[PDB]
Structure formats: structure tokens, C-alpha cells
């Protein structure tokens, strides 16, 4: 009898439960680094006293002992340093063995083999493979997160909420992160194998996967495709031919599957929250605690001015220059880890933003940027801090440009307009947690001023009191199909009567400020006595905005006002029209492996038919993949009632998400929390 292995029992279910990886829909062994796992190995005899056993684990195509991507270890007393295997018991020919990886092991798929030295002879057999993840339960892991409820929210929750809209109207969409769905973990690992860092130098790339700063950076870079290799094709054009409207996605699952199955070819099309939701799946799946952050009025300053410019003409059109300097909202991610590169005070939440691309400066993403560091203006620290600081801190400079004379002049500088209502989902609920005070000191504080100057450090001319002030107000209900009713309020603050000319326009836009089409314009001249206040009505019919309104449902309203011998005043507001309501109802108790009938309700509010009607539904633990249901054309003002079944696989509170689309309403959303009984 020369010593050899007969079987190995990996005790997969037990180890996954101990490792907090039991929720993944997978039969693989999935472990977290730095933590032991127990296997039973059946040999052909008891251990001979001359003989030797070594385990070998390796990851990646060029594994190296000096790079920590290969390790060779005997049965021993154990180890801090590295990998170790402890013989816990021998029972006949069966060995109870506790194997452990270091807290600094690279994540990813590993192979394990066993090399047996016996009778001046050596055997070797492949034992199997496993996946190794970051370990936010382990206090020596860089991703350690100590609080149980936060760890559950930020690693283990597969349903999410992303805040959208504007500073005037904060809404939300549901997002199915779906990191436990079939093949999603494996696809998120594949992101790392598809990076340019991997193709160029796989040995270095794999060895680098021990560092969450590196993994987060590579992951964030891959989501918004900057070549033909990333996950999503970005598109803020309003025109989504060849693809899906970015607003029609409800989760990361469909995206990541389509990516993989297409040969890792970009999925068409995403915008910033689509990237953030997808990046969030990847991070949580690999064990980096993470969450989605929305910033309102988010500035795009690549110039390190800490200021952006927006251009108008005297006729009250937004111009293309700077029309997207300040996004109504912009969504990114935070991940949770220490920053060994920065030091003890810069640990915790780190900004990771898949959206940015500046090829001229080699930026395929931003971060990780210590939020602590952003807030103190330590913008010399790695990575992408000047851009991130600016996103939440920039000044807004408004310019007039007159195409007839080619003259440009600075109208106003406005501080405190950018970086507002910075929002993320609360732990354990759908509430909006405001985290503005994490990125910034309080508005118009000494600290705020110190931080801004500090940061600025590391990176006519007169001032008017105009006679006339203005404000755009909404009258009544903003909804697609209904007319838009606004009023421009002007008030004369000077000691004398003034005559003001007002030129006004209204442009459909994408939420970042991409201008689509003029749909309405007006002008007015009026005299106002001192303190007089006047109202000019703005009415935009359905027929006027319908042809150019995008899934954003947004319209940019501008009024440039001018009294003789005074600087212009620019009054502006981006409005959001509500979709018609789409309702979901569960018609009986949700229980695991029992059919649950669900009802969609929709009333067409248009006096025309809506056609090409599709209802799309998904929800982790409720449906496998997604349901797409062809809905009959609705006539004018007609209602629709669609019944469908889900079939829950997992108990607890789950999230059902529904998209209804037709020719006139590209992406109406609905969501339901459903409590699923066991």
C-alpha cells in the first residue's frame, strides 16, 4: 500500500454557512480568506511515518509562491503567515483536516492538489477547486466591518434602492443587485479576468487581487465600457437604437448575464445608476461591503478649477457648452476598507465611480477616494480626489454668449449649488439616509471654507445688485400626458419702476443636461413698480413636448431677463414629469415553492393608443431571471389588468420590480416588498 487519496469530502454546506457564503446559488465551495475550513480526506491507509503530504493551492494562470498565488503546505501545527493545514483527527483512514488561508490571500478561484511523498516516490492529485472572497466578518481583513446589521446591509442584501431625480424632487428606483443568483458570482469574478490588467499581465493582476483597493479599481473600470470589453455601453444621447433604454433595466442580473453570454461584449445601454447598481453587485459578491450613493447637482470638472461653466444665449436658450456641467443627479458607489496606502485615519468608505472616462488622462473610472479625505480636502491623496471633491464642491459660473456678435460675458458665480442631498439607502429599510455631512462640512461654515481653500491650494469683475429677481414655480401636476403649467415670478427690488424684457425657452433634456430639442419658447416685456411682483404663465401642451421628451421625463426651463443698463438675470429650473402610475398587487400569501398570483394594473392616460406594450418583472428569490409579458395594445384612456405568477425560492422580505413600456412611455416603474413565508 503506497499512500494515496481515495475521496475528499469538502463539507461544502457546513463551510459555506460558517463562511457566510451559503446564499449564493451555486454548488461550489465558496470561502472567505483568513478563516479555516474543514474537510474529510479518506486515504488508502493510515499515515506512514516516513511519508509526507503537502497541499498545493494556486490561483490564476501563472501562480507564484513569492506572489502568494501559489502555496505549498504540509500538515503542521498551523500558521499566521500563510496557508496552513491542521490534522484535527484520524479515524481509521479518514482525516479530519482544518485548512486556512491568510487574511492577505488574493481572492478568486483556486485549485487544490495533494502531493504525497511515499516509498522514495511522489504522487500528486487534483483535489478540487474553490472560490475565495474577501472576509468582512474577519477583524484582520482590510474589508472588516464590525457591525452585524451594516455587514448584512452592505454585503448580504441583494435588493437595493437608488435615489434619483433632482434637488427639487427626489425619487427612487428599485434595483435587483442579485449577487446570489445563478452564475452571478462567477461572472463578477470574470470581470477581473477580462480587464486590460489581466490580458497585459495576468500574474501581476492575480497577485494584486489581495488588495480591495486594486479589485475595486479594476471592477469600477470595467463596468462602463471604454473599449469593446466592458460590461455596459454608456449612452446619454436620448437615442437608444440597437439597445435597451437605460431606464428599462431593473437590476444587475440581466446585464451581467447578457454580458457574459455575448462573449463579454458590452450591453446596450447604461447611464450612471446602471453602472453603480452593477458595480454594487460585483463588490458585494466579492465581499467588499458597498453601497450606492446619489449626489444631486453633481459637477463635471475635469479641469481642477473647482468650478464649472454653463452657457446661455440672450434669447434664453441653454447652449451646448456646459449644458451637462451639473448633472441633476449622479450615482456612484462606496466600498468599505482600510487604506494602508493612506494611513489609519483614511479607512472606511471609499468612493468608486464607474461612470468617468477621460482617456486623455488615463481615467476609466474614479477611486478609491477616501470619503474622510474628500471631506478634509486632502485631494493630493490617491485616487481621483480632485474630480471627486469637485463633484460635490464646485462653483457654478454662468456665461452669456451672443452668437451674432461673438461676445462672451460672465453673468454670475454661485457657490453652494452643487453636491446636495447626498443619499443612500438606510440600513434595513427603504428610507433615504442623507450622507451629505460625510462628504462635506455644513453649508457656509468656517470649516467648509477652510476645506475648499485648502483643496484649492493643492490645485466684468464687478458685482451687481439687479433690480429684478425671478423664480420659476410649478402650478399643478407635472405628469407625462398632462400639460406643464409653470409661472415665472419676477419682482422689482429697486427704488424705481423698471421695464424688463424676458426671453424664455424650454428644452427636453437627458438628466445629465444633454440638450435634446427646443419644445417651447416665449417672451414678455413688462414694467414693474418697486416691490411689484408679476407672474408670467408658461404652458407647454402634451403635443408640444411629446415628440422630444425622453425617458428622463425632464424639461429645462430658462428665462433670461434684462432691464436697460443692467446685467441679465438667468432664472432656470429643470422639471421632472411623473409617469402614469403602475401598480402591482400580490393576490395571495407569498410562500416558498408555492405559486403566487400577482396583478399588474395600468390606465393609459393618453387620448391615443399605446402599443408595443411590454411588462417586465424580476426579483431575486421570487423569479428566476425575468418575466417579459406582451400586453395588448391599449386604446385611449383604456385600462390594463395583467395577471402573472411568481414562485418564491427563498423566504423573508424580497423585492419585486416591474417595468412597463410602450411606444409612448418608455419605462414606467413599480416595486413591491413581498414577505415570503417559509
Amino acid at each position, epitope marked *: 500500500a503506497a499512500l494515496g487519496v481515495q475521496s475528499i469530502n469538502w463539507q461544502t454546506a457546513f463551510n459555506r454557512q460558517a463562511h457566510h457564503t451559503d446564499k449564493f446559488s451555486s454548488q461550489e465551495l465558496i470561502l472567505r480568506r483568513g478563516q479555516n475550513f474543514q474537510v474529510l480526506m479518506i486515504m488508502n491507509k493510515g499515515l506512514g511515518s516516513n511519508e509526507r503530504l503537502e497541499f498545493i493551492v494556486s490561483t490564476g494562470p501563472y501562480p507564484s509562491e513569492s506572489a502568494m498565488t501559489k502555496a505549498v503546505f504540509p500538515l503542521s501545527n498551523g500558521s499566521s503567515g500563510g496557508w496552513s493545514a491542521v490534522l484535527q483527527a484520524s479515524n481509521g483512514n479518514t482525516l479530519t483536516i482544518s485548512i486556512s488561508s491568510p487574511a492577505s490571500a488574493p481572492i478568486g478561484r483556486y485549485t487544490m492538489a495533494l502531493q504525497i511523498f511515499s516509498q522514495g516516490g511522489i504522487s500528486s492529485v487534483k483535489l478540487g477547486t474553490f472560490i475565495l472572497l474577501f472576509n468582512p466578518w474577519l477583524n484582520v481583513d482590510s474589508v472588516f466591518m464590525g457591525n452585524h446589521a451594516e455587514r448584512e446591509e452592505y454585503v448580504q442584501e441583494d435588493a437595493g434602492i437608488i435615489f434619483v431625480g433632482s434637488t427639487n424632487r427626489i425619487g427612487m428606483i428599485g434595483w435587483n443587485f442579485g449577487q446570489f443568483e445563478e452564475d452571478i458570482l462567477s461572472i463578477c469574478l470574470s470581470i477581473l479576468d477580462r480587464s486590460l490588467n489581466f490580458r497585459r499581465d495576468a500574474a501581476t493582476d492575480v497577485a494584486s487581487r489581495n488588495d480591495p483597493k486594486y479589485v475595486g479599481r479594476v471592477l469600477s473600470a470595467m463596468i462602463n465600457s471604454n473599449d469593446d470589453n466592458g460590461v455596459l455601453a454608456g449612452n446619454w444621447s436620448g437615442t437608444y437604437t440597437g439597445g435597451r433604454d437605460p431606464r428599462s433595466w431593473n437590476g444587475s442580473v440581466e446585464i451581467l448575464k447578457n454580458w457574459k*453570454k455575448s462573449g463579454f461584449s458590452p*450591453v446596450r445601454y447604461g447611464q450612471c445608476w446602471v453602472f453603480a447598481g452593477t458595480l454594487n453587485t460585483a463588490l458585494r459578491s466579492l465581499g467588499i461591503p458597498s453601497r450606492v450613493i446619489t449626489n444631486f447637482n453633481s459637477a463635471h470638472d475635469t479641469d481642477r478649477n473647482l468650478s464649472v461653466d454653463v452657457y446661455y444665449d440672450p434669447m434664453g436658450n441653454p447652449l451646448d457648452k456646459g449644458s451637462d456641467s451639473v448633472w441633476n443627479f449622479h450615482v456612484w458607489n462606496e466600498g468599505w476598507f482600510v487604506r494602508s496606502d493612506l494611513g489609519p485615519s483614511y479607512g472606511g468608505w471609499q468612493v468608486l465611480d464607474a461612470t468617468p472616462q477621460e482617456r486623455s488622462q488615463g481615467v476609466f473610472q474614479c477611486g478609491p477616494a477616501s470619503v474622510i479625505g474628500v471631506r478634509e480636502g486632502d485631494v493630493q491623496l490617491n485616487f481621483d480626489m480632485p474630480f471627486i471633491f469637485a463633484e460635490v464642491n464646485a462653483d457654478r459660473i454662468t456665461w452669456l454668449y451672443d452668437n451674432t456678435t461673438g461676445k462672451q460675458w460672465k453673468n454670475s458665480v454661485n457657490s453652494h449649488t452643487i453636491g446636495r442631498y447626498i443619499s443612500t439607502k438606510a440600513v434595513g429599510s427603504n428610507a433615504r439616509m442623507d450622507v451629505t455631512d460625510k462628504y462635506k462640512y455644513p453649508e457656509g461654515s468656517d470649516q467648509e471654507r477652510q476645506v475648499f481653500q485648502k483643496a484649492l491650494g493643492k490645485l466684468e469683475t464687478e458685482e451687481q445688485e439687479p433690480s429684478i429677481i425671478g423664480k420659476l414655480k410649478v402650478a399643478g401636476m407635472l405628469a407625462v400626458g398632462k400639460e406643464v403649467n409653470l409661472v415665472l415670478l419676477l419682482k422689482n427690488l429697486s427704488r424705481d419702476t423698471k421695464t424688463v424684457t424676458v426671453n424664455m425657452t424650454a428644452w427636453t433634456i437627458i438628466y445629465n443636461g444633454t440638450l435634446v430639442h427646443e419644445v417651447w419658447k416665449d417672451s414678455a416685456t413688462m414694467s414693474l413698480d418697486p416691490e411689484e411682483e408679476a407672474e408670467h404663465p408658461i404652458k407647454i401642451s402634451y403635443a408640444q413636448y411629446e415628440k422630444y421628451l425622453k425617458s428622463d421625463n425632464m424639461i429645462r426651463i430658462t428665462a433670461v431677463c434684462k432691464v436697460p443698463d443692467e446685467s441679465e438675470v438667468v432664472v432656470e429650473r429643470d422639471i421632472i414629469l411623473d409617469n402614469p402610475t403602475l401598480t402591482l398587487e400580490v393576490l395571495n400569501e407569498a410562500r416558498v415553492r408555492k405559486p403566487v398570483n400577482v396583478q399588474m394594473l395600468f390606465s393609459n392616460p393618453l387620448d391615443e393608443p399605446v402599443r*408595443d406594450c411590454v411588462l417586465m418583472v424580476e426579483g431575486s428569490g421570487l423569479l428566476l431571471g425575468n418575466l417579459k409579458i*406582451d400586453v395588448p395594445t391599449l386604446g385611449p384612456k383604456e385600462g390594463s389588468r395583467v395577471r402573472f405568477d411568481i414562485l418564491p425560492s427563498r423566504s423573508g422580505t424580497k423585492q419585486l420590480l416591474a417595468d412597463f413600456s410602450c411606444n409612448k412611455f418608455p419605462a414606467i416603474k413599480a416595486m413591491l416588498s413581498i414577505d415570503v413565508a417559509e
Partner: antibody
Amino acid sequence: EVQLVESGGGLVQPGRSLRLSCTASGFTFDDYAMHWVRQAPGKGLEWVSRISWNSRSIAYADSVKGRFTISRDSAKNSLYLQMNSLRTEDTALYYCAKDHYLGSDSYGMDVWGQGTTVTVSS
Amino acid sequence: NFMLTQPHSVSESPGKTVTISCTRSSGSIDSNYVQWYQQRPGSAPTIVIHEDNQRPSGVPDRFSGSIDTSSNSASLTISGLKTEDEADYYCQSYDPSNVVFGGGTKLTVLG
């Protein structure tokens, strides 16, 4: 519903040419790859050619490279197959199909036309 | 490239369940989506499964699909066989250029 109406098939002599057409309705033509697939009598489905939604990626079965050309015309919602150098083994029912996939470079045929028959004999 | 190999034929009696497999010759069956088509005599094919296991609007729930990584194969399974399910069945996938069809399986519902 989706309609794909094929035409241009008939009897043709080896060495010579046909051009097939397929006109589509009932969906956004320009959203989807389109394909020609063919079936010889009593035989399986053999894919012939794919053109991407934007006309910028084309693929051909090895059996037809050099000889067949696929194209599409957005304004006419039409797909074409130029078939040169015909051989009697090109004899087949030629189906026009719409790709299922919206916004990814995966392929499958969600809707098939009834086909136009091509018979190559001298 | 690769080929997809299906059995030449399968039969089962009405009410019973049948499975038709489709084996990919190289690369993983799970690398690319698998579709299934039904073709009755004299008709064009119609899709019955797409994206491995999703059922098109109006295909009955008796039709399901699956992937088995063990055998590198996809399967179409039809529960509750009716006489009208008798047809040729083809699987189909692709690499990033080319579409591959399996050879086709005749499904006889024994009568």
C-alpha cells in the same frame, strides 16, 4: 405582430445569381440583428448569415463565404441576400429571421418568415 | 467553432415527460445562450425556449429548458405530452460570430 415577408427565390442555374429580400414589420427593425437561415428538403436548419442592428458587424457560414452578401436598408425595413456562384447544394428554403436579443451580441431567431424557395439546377 | 449534437429521435406516450439534450462539442455550453425551436411539418420553426430556460410569451409551461455543465449539454423538457407536441426540435447557440444549430431531434408522441 411581427411580419417577415421573403421574396426573390426561384429556379436558377448553377454558377448564376439570385437576390433575396425580406421586408419586416411590427417591430423596430433597426433594434435587432437579422439573419438568413436555410433548410434543404428533409434536412436541418443551417444558419447562413447575420447582420448586426447597425450593419457594421456581419458574419457568414463558411459554406457561403466569397459567394453570398447580406445587407439591410433601414428606410425600407428590408434585409437582402445576394447569392452568387450558386451550386445545387444551395438548394433550400431560405428563411429570414429576426434576432431575439435587444442590446447584446447574442443570437437567436425569435421570429422566422415562411421562407422563399431556391432551387439550383441546370 | 463547435457543434451541437442532439439525439436523432425521442419518443414518449401522451401525458408523460420527455427530455431532449444538446451537447456542445467544444467550449462550455454555459458560455452562450441556448435556444430551442419547434418545427412542425410544412411550417417555419417557432421559438420555444430562449436564453437557456426562458419561455416566450405564449409557450406553455409544459416547456422548460436547462443547462447541465456536467455533460456540457442543454436540455429541453416537455411535461404533459400532447399529440400536437410531435415535431422536430432544434437547439441553437453561437460563438461571438457564428450561429450553430444542432442537427434536430424528431419527437414522437407514441400513438
